[PDB]
Design a protein around this ligand. Structure first.
Ligand SMILES: NC(=O)c1ccc[n+]([C@@H]2O[C@H](COP(=O)([O-])OP(=O)(O)OC[C@H]3O[C@@H](n4cnc5c(N)ncnc54)[C@H](OP(=O)(O)O)[C@@H]3O)[C@@H](O)[C@H]2O)c1
Ligand SMILES: CCc1nc(N)nc(N)c1OCCCOc1cccc(C[C@H](C(=O)O)C(F)F)c1
Ligand SMILES: [Br-]
Ligand SMILES: [Br-]
Ligand SMILES: [Cl-]
Length: 158
């Protein structure tokens, strides 16, 4: 059982300049609630992107995928491939390169869509594209306490 979870702008951007280009508290609560107690699998750049006070992610087995040798990610397990990372319920938490690896092995995608306008720039990290082999159910557009509009989508593999 492999699930992907990500937050994207409407245009499909998930990352810019080594971080996430918006702040959405309700998404962090959603992310924490869905991943707590499970293994979280991430690419090395995404590990690097975690704020120090949240690295490693507490209450979850953190697995970092890299091509480096002897990489030290304190409090995490370091592996050399996605297959190694996956040997109950496992969540792949980004970024774009690791999503692209994990999508064919996944039965579930949990997407937060953030209604901000961010035209993709050259080096952006982009969300994977889901076709009609995926069955989605969406919540309503909601307004965060901070004022940003967002909505949750849950996709299962048909
Ligand atoms: N909005 C969201 O939901 C979300 C979620 C996660 C991350 N992000 C953002 O996305 C960006 C990071 O994503 P990214 O696509 O640049 O990077 P990434 O997928 O997190 O990590 C890329 C790294 O993964 C390793 N890697 C890639 N393919 C591999 C393979 N086949 N075997 C072994 N290791 C492999 C390499 O590590 P080495 O270079 O060490 O060899 C590579 O540099 C940041 O901006 C981050 O903030 C956003
Ligand atoms: C949280 C952004 C996000 N959103 C969805 N939907 N999917 C994702 N893959 C995703 O990026 C995961 C990589 C970044 O991760 C975090 C960075 C800072 C804080 C937290 C939450 C933290 C925790 O979880 O303890 C606590 F503050 F709540 C996660
Ligand atoms: Br963030
Ligand atoms: Br926040
Ligand atoms: Cl979407």
């Amino acid at each position: 059982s492999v699930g992907l979870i990500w937050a994207q702008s409407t245009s499909g951007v998930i990352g810019r300049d080594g971080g996430i280009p918006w702040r959405l508290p309700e998404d962090l609560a959603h992310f924490k609630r869905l991943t707590m107690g499970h293994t979280v699998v991430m690419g090395r750049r995404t590990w690097d992107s975690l704020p120090a006070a949240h690295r490693p992610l507490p209450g979850r087995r953190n697995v970092v995928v890299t091509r480096q040798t002897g990489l030290v990610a304190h409090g995490a397990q370091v592996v050399g491939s996605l297959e190694q990372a996956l040997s109950a319920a496992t969540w792949v938490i980004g970024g774009a390169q690791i999503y692209a690896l994990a999508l064919p092995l996944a039965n579930r995608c949990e997407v937060t869509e953030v209604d901000v306008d961010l035209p993709p720039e050259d080096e952006d990290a982009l969300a994977p594209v889901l076709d009609q082999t995926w069955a989605g159910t969406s919540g309503e557009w909601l307004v965060s306490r901070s004022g940003l509009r967002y909505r949750m989508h849950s996709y299962r593999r048909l």
